[PDB]
Amino acid sequence: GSNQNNF
Ligand SMILES: [Zn+2]
């Protein structure tokens, strides 16, 4: 799957 981190 794809991943996104919004710090
Ligand atoms: Zn993946």
Q: Which amino acid is at 1?
A: G
2 CA to centre of ligand 1 in angstroms: 5
Query: What are the structure tokens assigned to 1, written together?
Result: 């799957």
4 CA to centre of ligand 1 in angstroms: 11
DSSP assignment letter at 1: -
Q: How far apart are CA 6 and CA 2, in angstroms?
A: 14
5 CA to centre of ligand 1 in angstroms: 13
Largest CA distance in the chain: 19
Experiment type: electron diffraction
1 CA to centre of ligand 1 in angstroms: 3
Resolution in A: 1.2
What secondary structure does DSSP assign to the chain, as a single string?
Answer: -------
Q: Name the 3-class secondary structure at 3.
A: coil
